[PDB]
Write an enzyme that holds these catalytic residues in place. Sequence first.
Site, PDB file in Angstrom:
ATOM      1  N   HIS A   8      46.070  -2.781 -60.289  1.00 20.73           N
ATOM      2  CA  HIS A   8      46.164  -4.327 -59.793  1.00 20.73           C
ATOM      3  C   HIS A   8      47.482  -3.471 -58.710  1.00 20.73           C
ATOM      4  O   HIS A   8      47.636  -4.500 -57.963  1.00 20.73           O
ATOM      5  CB  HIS A   8      47.360  -4.624 -60.855  1.00 20.73           C
ATOM      6  CG  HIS A   8      46.011  -5.393 -62.177  1.00 20.73           C
ATOM      7  ND1 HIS A   8      44.530  -6.106 -61.109  1.00 20.73           N
ATOM      8  CD2 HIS A   8      46.083  -5.851 -63.315  1.00 20.73           C
ATOM      9  CE1 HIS A   8      44.199  -6.123 -62.074  1.00 20.73           C
ATOM     10  NE2 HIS A   8      44.513  -6.379 -62.818  1.00 20.73           N
ATOM     11  N   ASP A  48      39.322  -3.716 -71.629  1.00 18.06           N
ATOM     12  CA  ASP A  48      39.335  -5.100 -71.797  1.00 18.06           C
ATOM     13  C   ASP A  48      38.266  -5.703 -72.194  1.00 18.06           C
ATOM     14  O   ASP A  48      38.517  -7.109 -72.095  1.00 18.06           O
ATOM     15  CB  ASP A  48      41.166  -5.273 -71.415  1.00 18.06           C
ATOM     16  CG  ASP A  48      40.413  -5.293 -69.575  1.00 18.06           C
ATOM     17  OD1 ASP A  48      39.985  -4.373 -69.036  1.00 18.06           O
ATOM     18  OD2 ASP A  48      41.543  -5.533 -69.163  1.00 18.06           O
ATOM     19  N   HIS A  97      38.933  -6.904 -65.475  1.00 12.88           N
ATOM     20  CA  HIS A  97      39.798  -7.807 -63.930  1.00 12.88           C
ATOM     21  C   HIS A  97      39.143  -6.467 -62.815  1.00 12.88           C
ATOM     22  O   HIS A  97      39.023  -5.194 -63.173  1.00 12.88           O
ATOM     23  CB  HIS A  97      41.277  -7.470 -64.330  1.00 12.88           C
ATOM     24  CG  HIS A  97      41.650  -8.418 -65.319  1.00 12.88           C
ATOM     25  ND1 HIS A  97      42.463  -7.537 -66.390  1.00 12.88           N
ATOM     26  CD2 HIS A  97      41.626  -9.462 -66.599  1.00 12.88           C
ATOM     27  CE1 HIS A  97      42.727  -8.547 -67.342  1.00 12.88           C
ATOM     28  NE2 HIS A  97      42.429  -9.850 -66.829  1.00 12.88           N
ATOM     29  N   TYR A 157      43.401  -4.487 -75.029  1.00 14.06           N
ATOM     30  CA  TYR A 157      44.438  -5.056 -75.629  1.00 14.06           C
ATOM     31  C   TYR A 157      44.225  -5.075 -77.382  1.00 14.06           C
ATOM     32  O   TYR A 157      45.209  -4.859 -78.175  1.00 14.06           O
ATOM     33  CB  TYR A 157      45.062  -5.745 -75.021  1.00 14.06           C
ATOM     34  CG  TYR A 157      45.503  -5.674 -73.323  1.00 14.06           C
ATOM     35  CD1 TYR A 157      46.346  -4.708 -73.119  1.00 14.06           C
ATOM     36  CD2 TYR A 157      43.741  -6.135 -72.592  1.00 14.06           C
ATOM     37  CE1 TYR A 157      46.310  -4.694 -72.065  1.00 14.06           C
ATOM     38  CE2 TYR A 157      44.507  -5.812 -70.759  1.00 14.06           C
ATOM     39  CZ  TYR A 157      45.796  -5.074 -70.557  1.00 14.06           C
ATOM     40  OH  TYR A 157      46.145  -4.837 -69.608  1.00 14.06           O
TER      41      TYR A 157
HETATM   42  O1  LIG Z   1      46.152  -5.499 -66.970  1.00 13.40           O
HETATM   43  C1  LIG Z   1      45.097  -6.429 -67.381  1.00 13.40           C
HETATM   44  N1  LIG Z   1      44.391  -6.628 -67.630  1.00 13.40           N
HETATM   45  O2  LIG Z   1      43.783  -5.123 -68.201  1.00 13.40           O
HETATM   46  C2  LIG Z   1      46.416  -7.552 -67.090  1.00 13.40           C
HETATM   47  C3  LIG Z   1      45.755  -8.422 -67.705  1.00 13.40           C
HETATM   48  N2  LIG Z   1      46.638 -10.068 -67.664  1.00 13.40           N
HETATM   49  C4  LIG Z   1      47.609 -10.488 -66.607  1.00 13.40           C
HETATM   50  N3  LIG Z   1      48.571 -11.438 -66.209  1.00 13.40           N
HETATM   51  C5  LIG Z   1      48.041 -12.544 -67.268  1.00 13.40           C
HETATM   52  C6  LIG Z   1      48.854 -12.063 -68.544  1.00 13.40           C
HETATM   53  C7  LIG Z   1      49.829 -11.994 -69.145  1.00 13.40           C
HETATM   54  C8  LIG Z   1      50.896 -10.922 -69.880  1.00 13.40           C
HETATM   55  C9  LIG Z   1      49.639 -11.182 -71.246  1.00 13.40           C
HETATM   56  C10 LIG Z   1      48.612 -11.961 -71.580  1.00 13.40           C
HETATM   57  C11 LIG Z   1      48.661 -11.902 -69.935  1.00 13.40           C
HETATM   58  C12 LIG Z   1      49.662 -13.383 -66.803  1.00 13.40           C
HETATM   59  C13 LIG Z   1      48.916 -14.322 -65.836  1.00 13.40           C
HETATM   60  C14 LIG Z   1      47.499 -14.929 -66.527  1.00 13.40           C
HETATM   61  F1  LIG Z   1      47.100 -15.913 -66.884  1.00 13.40           F
HETATM   62  F2  LIG Z   1      46.841 -15.310 -64.738  1.00 13.40           F
HETATM   63  C15 LIG Z   1      46.023 -13.673 -66.655  1.00 13.40           C
HETATM   64  C16 LIG Z   1      47.228 -12.894 -67.691  1.00 13.40           C
HETATM   65  N4  LIG Z   1      47.907  -8.842 -65.920  1.00 13.40           N
HETATM   66  C17 LIG Z   1      47.096  -7.792 -65.842  1.00 13.40           C
HETATM   67  K   LIG Z   2      37.187  -3.986 -62.372  1.00 14.86           K
HETATM   68 ZN   LIG Z   3      42.429  -5.324 -67.058  1.00 16.23          ZN
END
Ligand SMILES: O=C(NO)c1cnc(NC2(c3ccccc3)CCC(F)(F)CC2)nc1
Ligand SMILES: [K+]
Ligand SMILES: [Zn+2]
Length: 364
Positions: A140, A271, A180, A311
């Site tokens: 990201h 994930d 993602h 996760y």
């Molecule tokens: O790296 C990743 N996954 O592999 C990853 C996953 N979740 C987030 N952000 C979100 C997230 C942040 C912390 C804990 C759970 C979810 C927060 C904003 C959201 F609600 F829009 C999406 C989820 N960011 C990166």
């Molecule tokens: K991907």
């Molecule tokens: Zn991811």
Amino acid sequence: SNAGGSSPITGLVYDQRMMLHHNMWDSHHPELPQRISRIFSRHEELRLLSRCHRIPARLATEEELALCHSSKHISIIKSSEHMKPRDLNRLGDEYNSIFISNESYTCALLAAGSCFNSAQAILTGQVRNAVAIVRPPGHHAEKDTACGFCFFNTAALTARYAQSITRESLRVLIVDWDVHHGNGTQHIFEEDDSVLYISLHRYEDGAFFPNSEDANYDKVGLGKGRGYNVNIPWNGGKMGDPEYMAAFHHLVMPIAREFAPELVLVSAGFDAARGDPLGGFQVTPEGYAHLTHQLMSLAAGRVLIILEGGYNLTSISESMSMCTSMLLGDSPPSLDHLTPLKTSATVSINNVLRAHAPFWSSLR
Ligand SMILES: O=C(NO)c1cnc(NC2(c3ccccc3)CCC(F)(F)CC2)nc1
Ligand SMILES: [K+]
Ligand SMILES: [Zn+2]
Ligand SMILES: [K+]
């Protein structure tokens, strides 16, 4: 010597120092230090660790980071090393989904340097393939900003590092099977025909993080890079082994063979795995084993598997250990009965086929 050939070696990089990056305000944030120690421990349990050649971690240098990132971005993250907690909190809050501790910058450097060392070992024939058990993740992160638990784009930097020690036009495939979209990786290579980026991701018409239509199937690359960005977006279905296998059969592998990469990097988030609290999908460890096995047919087997997200600690440990088992040449495990494809997955596959048939004769 390798006179007369020799058994291929699989490299493994893991350094417990990358556990030091941590969330001092929400200690249950899912991007946990023990993601990498649990994966490493599962490799010991399954007796995979002693079968690998251990590759050392190292720090990326600031000039290596500048292969993909602006000096401003590097300087800002570097400056967090000596911040007090209230200022780390404020700095994290300037980004989307970022926490920062005094060790984050060094951990991001180790994740990148570990992958450089692994790509180096592959490209010089020290090993055939490798697994990198690293955090924080990378895909990201953009040239100019951190995002989504990622500070620097490890996989993108590794592709540029590989080109930097072979030749500028070395063909690198990045397959991103994290649930993602890897927005940063897409953007870094969007105009580049030397790096082919193929992402599968939960999309939901733009509702799923990172919430941008950049992840849709019609984003095929720009300029010379047209055709070299392949987004496979999933909508409206709890996707799993049948859908990912179909995507590899119709899209990923035909395009990859036609590209004929000289190195394969896997942005291997887990994930999309059964049990993940964030992804909601159901790819099994055996499914990941089969995806790995297919990628091993590319680039004369020069594949580097780089941990991104994922996760559920038990799921990611079993899934990434499956992948290492495949890199080591073990016979692929049996898949469960493939249920018929979710109908919306066929819709997505057909949309990508229409978007990319103009650029890839293998799809016509
Ligand atoms: O790296 C990743 N996954 O592999 C990853 C996953 N979740 C987030 N952000 C979100 C997230 C942040 C912390 C804990 C759970 C979810 C927060 C904003 C959201 F609600 F829009 C999406 C989820 N960011 C990166
Ligand atoms: K991907
Ligand atoms: Zn991811
Ligand atoms: K590209």
